Amino acid sequence: KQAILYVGHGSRVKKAQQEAAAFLEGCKAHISVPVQEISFLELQEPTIETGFEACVKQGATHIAVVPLLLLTAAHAKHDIPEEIVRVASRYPSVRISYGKPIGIDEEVVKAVYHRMKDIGVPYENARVVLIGRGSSDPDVKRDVTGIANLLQEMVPVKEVIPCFLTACGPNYKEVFSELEKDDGITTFIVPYLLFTGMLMNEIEREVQKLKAHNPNVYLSSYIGFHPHVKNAFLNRVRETAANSEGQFDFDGGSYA
Ligand code: NI
Ligand code: NI
């Protein structure tokens, strides 16, 4: 029988644990699949081993493993697949599919669009600065830039500047330094993050200093588990379960 195994990265923040668990629970009613389990790589239970084993114990013959990830980096390519292989080696008879992070999807740009609209200031011909966490893995910058291009195509903005909190450039603090001008162009700052936290507070403080220089700057709320993010993730789940060409086939001989 078919199963879905949702995999979040997990958190050490009690609230982040609750938000991720509740989001994954609320996903279940949208998927016409009878066996569905949530799990987390780290810091938070159910572990991946527990959720996978629950799928098998409920009689699953096929397990669609879907990572709750905005972008593609070490978690999606390596850490999570290794945990999958570690537990799945013990059940060699179980067929596995493994999904993609949300990535470049029209729905997440729509989530960004609604975060922009929420400020209530005209966005026509406005600049957008899209802040992702960042990674040394080049796929992350590649995907954030792709999302920026999609936002550019879908919303009548002047330009979209992807930038990052860490690991790869440009850092959002350099972009901010180039935006102290005030040329009459409105600038929206959109944090491309699933959760608030240390980095959101840092962004808040840095945007305050920038607003001290340039009053035409507006910080939106972070993307979070926006309904359009939910739509995009549900797309991922459905495509992983269908696996129509076998493009999501996964083994049990360590692929990462
Ligand atoms: Ni390794
Ligand atoms: Ni909408």
Our CA angle for 98, 71, 56, nearest 5°, is 25
Separation between Cα atoms, residue 147 and residue 160, nearest integer Å: 9
The beta strand positions in the chain, using DSSP E, are 2-8, 35-40, 62-67, 95-98, 127-132, 159-164, 187-192, 217-219, 249-250
Residue that the structure tokens 């990462």 belong to: 256
Strands 95-98 and 127-132: unpaired
Record the tokens describing residue 223, joined without a space: 């993307």
Separation between Cα atoms, residue 129 and residue 187, nearest integer Å: 7
| CA 232 vs CA 123, 181, 226: distances in Å | 24, 36, 10
The beta strand positions in 77-175, using DSSP E, are 95-98, 127-132, 159-164
Separation between Cα atoms, residue 146 and residue 162, nearest integer Å: 9
Q: Which ligand is nearest to the CA of 111?
A: 2
Closest listed residue to residue 135, CA positions, set 70, 48, 182, 214: 70
Please give the distance, rounded to the nearest whole angstrom, from the Cα atom of residue 87 to the centre of ligand 2.
39
Closest listed residue to residue 147, CA positions, set 56, 71, 67: 71
Method: X-ray
- Contacts (Cβ under 8 Å, ≥6 apart) of 97: 62, 63, 64, 65, 240, 241, 243, 248, 249, 250
Please give the distance, rounded to the nearest whole angstrom, from the Cα atom of residue 78 to the centre of ligand 1.
7
Strand partners, 163: 131
The 187-192 sheet, strands edge to edge:
159-164, 127-132, 187-192, 217-219
Is the CA virtual torsion 46, 48, 50, 52 positive or negative? positive
Separation between Cα atoms, residue 150 and residue 108, nearest integer Å: 10
Q: Which ligand is nearest to the CA of 228?
A: 2
Record the tokens describing residue 169, joined without a space: 């450039």
Strands 2-8 and 159-164: unpaired
Q: Which ligand is nearest to the CA of 113?
A: 2
Are the beta carbons of 33 and 1 closer than 8 angstroms? no
Record the tokens describing residue 123, joined without a space: 């966005």
Our CA angle for 30, 234, 101, nearest 5°, is 155
Resolution of the structure, angstroms: 2.8
| CA 81 vs CA 75, 144, 146, 226, 227: distances in Å | 8, 23, 25, 27, 27
Please give the distance, rounded to the nearest whole angstrom, from the Cα atom of residue 66 to the centre of ligand 1.
20
Record the tokens describing residue 5, joined without a space: 């195994």
Please give the distance, rounded to the nearest whole angstrom, from the Cα atom of residue 44 to the centre of ligand 2.
32
Q: State the binding site.
A: 9, 75
Separation between Cα atoms, residue 2 and residue 73, nearest integer Å: 27
Q: Which ligand is nearest to the CA of 106?
A: 2
Largest CA distance in the chain: 63
